[PDB]
Structures are given as C-alpha cells and as structure tokens.
Paper text:
Obscurin, or its homolog obscurin-like-1, bridges the giant ruler titin and the myosin crosslinker myomesin at the M-band. Myomesin is a 185 kDa modular protein that localizes exclusively at the M-band, where anti-parallel dimers cross link myosin filaments. In addition to a mechanical role, myomesin is also needed for the integration of obscurin and its smaller obscurin-like-1 homolog at the M-band (Fukuzawa et al., 2008). Yeast two-hybrid and biochemical analyses have mapped the obscurin/obscurin-like-1:myomesin interaction to the linker region (L) located between the fourth and fifth Fn-III domains of myomesin (My4 and My5, respectively) and the third Ig domain of either obscurin or obscurin-like-1 (O3 and OL3, respectively) (inset) (Fukuzawa et al., 2008).
The ability of OL3:My4L to transition from the solution conformation to that observed crystallographically suggests that the LH helix might have a degree of flexibility. We explored this by solving the crystal structure of My4LH (myomesin residues 510–618) in two different space groups (data collection and refinement statistics in Table 1). In space group P65 (2.05 Å resolution), all four My4LH independent molecules in the a.u. display clear electron density until residue A608, while residues E609-S618 (LH) cannot be modeled. The same applies for four of six My4LH independent molecules in the alternative P21 space group (2.80 Å resolution). However, in the latter crystal structure, crystal contacts stabilize the C-terminal region in the remaining two other My4LH molecules. While in one molecule, LH folds into an α-helix as in the My4L:OL3 complex, in the other molecule the C-terminus is in a more extended conformation. Overall, SAXS and crystallographic analyses support a model in which interdomain freedom allows the transition from a relatively compact solution conformation to an open one that can be stabilized by homodimerization.
Numbering used by the authors: 508 to 608
Amino acid sequence: STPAAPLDVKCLEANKDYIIISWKQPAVDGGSPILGYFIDKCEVGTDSWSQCNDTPVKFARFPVTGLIEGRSYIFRVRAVNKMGIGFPSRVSEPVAALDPA
C-alpha cells in the first residue's frame, strides 16, 4: 500500500530568508521503497497550506523559502512511493522568520 506518516518534524535553523526543517522516516513503507517526500507550510493565523518543493526530496532536510519577514509558520511532511502518497505527518511547532540574536 502507501507509506506511513513521517515523524518528529523539527526546525534545525531559522532565518528571515529561509527556514531549514528535518524529519525522521516513517515506520512502514507499505511494501514498496520510498521514492521521496513533499513538504508543506502554513501561516499560523491562517488555514492555507502550500506545497514547498516541486520534486520529491530523497533525504531528511529541506530549506523553505518564499517567506514574509516576521510571520510565523507551521510545517508538515508527506512520504511517497509507486503506490501513492501517504498521510501527512503531525504538524511541527510554530517557527518565525527572523534572524537570530
């Protein structure tokens, strides 16, 4: 079948121009090897989800761009294989687009 949801979506680094996020791979691939992942972002006061990357990324890190300085976002990740796209991960903690210090 399709894969399981990825786990533990965390923020590695936050900046006003980009936010780097990571995740762990789902506990079940459903019989087919995983082909990649799709990352989605959402502004905290809104319910608008948008896909961040055009093609699936193979590994556990991704830099998100297209942000507005000062706004906060939450993120989710979806795994995919030849059978299809699985359920998304649990949403991450909110992260603000601001330079450190």
